[PDB]
Design a protein around this nucleic acid. Structure first.
Length: 54
DNA sequence: CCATCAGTGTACTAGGACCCGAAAATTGAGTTACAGAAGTAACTGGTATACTCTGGTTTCTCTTCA
């Protein structure tokens, strides 16, 4: 099994494809938006907390 | 006439909740220790909203000088 995996022989569950449902196409958008908000907020939130600590 | 091009008649998926039972885990009582923390169960002040005469007031005729 390890030697087979080393040769890059895809197991059955790796070649297993499933269609992108519509609610997933919505969750993705909402989640990317939320993650970008968090990533942009974290620096400024930390700066604000540091100013408060000083 | 051999190209092309919807429909069709199905088992075979794809999500999509949902259920059925089993097995493991817990709860619960019983004891007896142990220390300390919750968790009510109790008496005992403390200060305000009505409250009840009361002290003053107010004309209104009169009192007392003047």
């Amino acid at each position: 099994t390890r030697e087979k995996a080393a040769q890059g022989i895809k197991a059955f569950e790796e070649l297993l494809v499933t269609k992108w449902k519509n609610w997933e196409k919505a969750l993705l958008r909402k989640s990317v938006v939320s993650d970008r908000l968090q990533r942009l907020l974290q620096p400024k939130l930390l700066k604000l907390e540091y100013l408060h600590q000083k």
